[PDB]
Design a protein around this nucleic acid. Structure first.
Lengths: 112, 116, 47, 102, 49, 145
RNA sequence: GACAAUGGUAGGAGAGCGUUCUAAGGGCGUUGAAGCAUGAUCGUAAGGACAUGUGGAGCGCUUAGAAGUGAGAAUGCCGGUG
RNA sequence: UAACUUGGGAGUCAGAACAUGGGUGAUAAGGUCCGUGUUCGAAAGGGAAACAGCCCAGACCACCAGCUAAGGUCCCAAAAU
RNA sequence: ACCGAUAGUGAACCAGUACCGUGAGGGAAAGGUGAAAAGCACCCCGGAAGGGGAGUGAAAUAGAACCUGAAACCGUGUGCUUACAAGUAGUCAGAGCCCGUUAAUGGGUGAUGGCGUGCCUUUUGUAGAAUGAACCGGCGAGUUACGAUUUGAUGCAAGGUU
């Protein structure tokens, strides 16, 4: 079957969370978890919590085997952006963008 | 009575955006650049619909020349002879015959060689 | 000192070809079940 | 065996059992048309006519009488505010070679 | 005479001319006013006579 | 689009030829070879595909010129460097490396396109009279002056 | 039917397409209207239809009438995203 | 096969090469000022390698038909080694 | 035959209010769940936020809640194609692969060949190294009231009209 878990409004730029999503795409649940505990990034800890939740849903709501699962899909969409200001040289003011992210993970066993 | 110009500009712009399908870059997205490309496309087709009648005629002549050079003769000499013989075959037909039934072409040359 | 023309999506995606992370060592443990870094302090301490 | 007929304003190399497209003719779908302008007759015997082979005809049957794909003609001036858009549909006629009475 | 099928006298009404509405109508950007000068300015023109 | 035969793959037949440059004008010989390479003497000639054959010059070191062309007719070449212009007379280019003298000459009468470069790779020039292509069984080809 | 004729800027003149509202007549709609998306469809052009998906209450046709009636450029104004 | 009269709307008042007849300049200028023509302006198409003003010629639309003009026919590249 | 949330008052909502200036003064942005809160009891992952089930409902429509397009922009997966090549990126010709429509001399990609210096404004002349536009989504320029003159239409006519 197929199980998924999403994390909305995640305070983290989508370009930085898309660098750790290209390391667990098409890997096994076991390997993926091990790779997320060795990666030195600020998104690994957040992504690891989402992957864990996705596995629990496939072992409870679908009661599937968690010893033969494989990460099928894994992407991150953009979310509401906050607008901020900070002073410059003279009386000018530059703009700051605090973008968010919508992490999503779909775990499956590879069987219709 | 006020008249809103909605659902009339998008419908006209969408038609031009669908006419530029298969372009490279943002030429199949942005309407501004798309329009310019479409306009140029139409100007090329019109001018390329008259150059296609000259390109194909240049091809036939080439083929005939090669096929007419296998019987110790030149295109200019063959063409001249055929006209004096009274034949009215087209250049596209003359080439087609030579490519396929080569035996038939041989006879034609003989007739043109008899008219000197 | 300022861009003469804006960069396209093609050229921008071509410059980000070597911009990525690399998978680490991740040495297997003899008695713990979980993985660990090579030449580290744990239950594996490398292999 | 093949023959070279001259219909409309050009020449076509047809053969027994073959579909061809010519200019709008004056007939009705399901009728029989016969060409009397034969310039060449290939196959076993070779008959090369002078202006045209005397005593040569080709019969065929009309199949359809529709129009071609719509062509959009569009031209314009560089800076001069002037342009023109136009459509076109060249009418045609589909026939099927029957016999080649040499 | 039926209110759902009225008909005005043949050739007794015409549509007004609108300038500055495309280049296919004939009166484009210049709207038949030439190029520059004092007769091309808004509210321009010398006093009659 | 009525009916016009168009050559393509699995329909083109390329053969091998052996031309002799024994007492032949450089330009006069090159011109003839060029046409053969492009395949303009074939009845099924097509411009968007290669239908030419392979040519093989045997002699090439016995090529002759006309007038004082061996003393003049210098061959210049730049190396994309300030003041990097080198030259060499045709007569001095015939004594050493005479195969390049014919190659360039025949390569200058071909179109400068992708097909033009691929059509120029079907030419083999030598200096002696023995070619290592006996497995292709190439036949002699008389120059139609 | 002949017979000629048909390049175009400033500018003359003629014939039309579409948009919002009103009148009269005849119609459509929870068995799914307008809008939105997709399509290999029709007209000489501006344009017009059908079918399918989303949508959940209004909307077009015929002949007239009245206009805040058509957008690619003004270092145009405002928002959004590069 | 045009012309004239009367009336309704106009735009134009910075022109440019080329070939002739002249002034000015130095029988200098892609100079400048007149007169007689043609083309560009507002004209695509072929030739002059590329080249608004040179030469040939004015595009209602379609066709994988034919005859010519200037200029051309060894290869690039249509046609005489 | 007025407007329908960039419209109509500056103000449909927290308007002369946030804010800005020593002061006189200047002056915004912002409407919409459903017929009825019946506003997600309960279980699972998690510190929480957020999610997956299960439930109420005609339909999650779930409290950044009618519809939700783009010029946009940012992604994930796939059918064809690409690492010897000089490019206003298109147009005509055209193999090879892959599909199957409003069914018609079909559709998608495209190895190779020929031809080809964007658009507007201003100029005798602009590919111009002259001007303007980052991406147009919305708004944004011959109008009305009185007179005058000429043309078309209708009514009556030595009378015509208030």
């Amino acid at each position: 079957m197929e199980a998924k878990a999403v994390a909305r409004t995640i305070r983290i730029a989508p370009r930085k969370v898309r660098l750790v999503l290209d390391l667990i795409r098409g890997k096994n649940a076991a390997e993926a978890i091990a790779i997320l505990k060795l990666t030195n990034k600020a998104s690994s800890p957040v992504i690891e919590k989402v992957l864990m939740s996705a596995l629990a849903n496939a072992e409870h709501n679908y009661d599937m085997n968690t010893d033969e699962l494989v990460v099928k899909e894994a992407y991150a969409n953009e979310g509401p952006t906050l607008k901020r200001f900070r002073p410059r040289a003279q009386g000018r003011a530059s703009a700051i963008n605090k973008r968010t992210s919508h992490i999503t993970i779909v775990v499956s066993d590879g069987k219709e | 009575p006020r008249v809103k110009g909605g659902t009339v500009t998008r419908a006209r712009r969408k038609k031009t955006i669908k006419l530029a399908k298969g372009y490279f870059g943002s030429k199949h997205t942005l309407y501004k650049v798309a329009k310019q490309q479409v306009m140029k496309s139409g100007q090329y087709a019109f001018r390329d619909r008259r150059q296609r009648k000259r390109d194909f005629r240049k091809l036939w002549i080439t083929r005939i020349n090669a096929a007419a050079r296998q019987h110790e003769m030149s295109y200019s000499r063959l063409m001249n002879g055929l006209k004096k013989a009274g034949i009215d075959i087209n250049r596209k037909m003359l080439s087609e015959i030579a490519i396929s039934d080569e035996k038939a072409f041989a006879q034609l040359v003989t007739k043109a060689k008899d008219a000197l | 000192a300022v861009p003469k023309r804006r960069t396209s999506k093609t050229r921008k995606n071509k410059r980000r070809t070597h911009f990525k992370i690399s998978v680490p060592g991740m040495t297997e443990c003899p008695n713990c079940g979980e993985y660990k870094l090579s030449h580290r302090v744990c239950k594996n301490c490398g292999s | 065996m093949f023959a070279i007929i001259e219909t409309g304003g050009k020449q076509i190399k047809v053969e027994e059992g073959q579909e061809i497209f010519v200019e709008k003719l004056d007939v009705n779908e399901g009728d029989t048309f016969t060409f009397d302008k034969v310039l060449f007759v290939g196959g076993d015997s070779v008959k090369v006519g002078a202006p045209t082979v005397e005593g040569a005809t080709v019969t065929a049957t009309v199949n359809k009488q529709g129009r071609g794909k719509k062509i959009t003609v569009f031209t314009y001036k560089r800076r001069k505010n002037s342009k023109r858009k136009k459509g076109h549909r060249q009418p045609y006629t589909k026939l099927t070679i029957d016999k080649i009475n040499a | 005479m039926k209110l759902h099928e009225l008909k005005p006298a043949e050739g007794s009404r015409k549509e007004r001319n609108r300038v500055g509405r495309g280049v296919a109508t004939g009166n484009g950007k210049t709207s038949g006013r030439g190029h520059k000068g004092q007769k091309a300015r808004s509210g321009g023109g010398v006093r009659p006579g | 689009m009525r009916q016009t035969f168009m050559a393509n793959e699995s329909n083109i037949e390329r053969k091998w030829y052996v031309i002799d440059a024994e007492g032949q004008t450089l330009g006069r010989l090159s011109s003839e070879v060029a046409s053969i390479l492009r395949g303009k003497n074939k009845v099924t000639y097509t411009p968007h595909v290669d239908t030419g054959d392979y040519v093989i010059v045997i002699n090439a070191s016995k090529i002759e010129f006309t007038g004082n062309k061996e003393t003049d007719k210098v061959y210049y070449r730049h190396s994309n460097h300030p003041g990097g212009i080198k030259s060499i007379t045709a007569g001095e280019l015939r004594r050493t490396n005479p195969e390049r003298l014919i190659e360039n000459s025949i390569k200058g009468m071909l179109p400068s396109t992708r097909l033009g470069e691929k059509q120029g790779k079907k030419l083999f020039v030598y200096g002696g009279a023995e070619h290592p292509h006996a497995a292709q069984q190439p036949e002699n080809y008389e120059l139609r002056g």
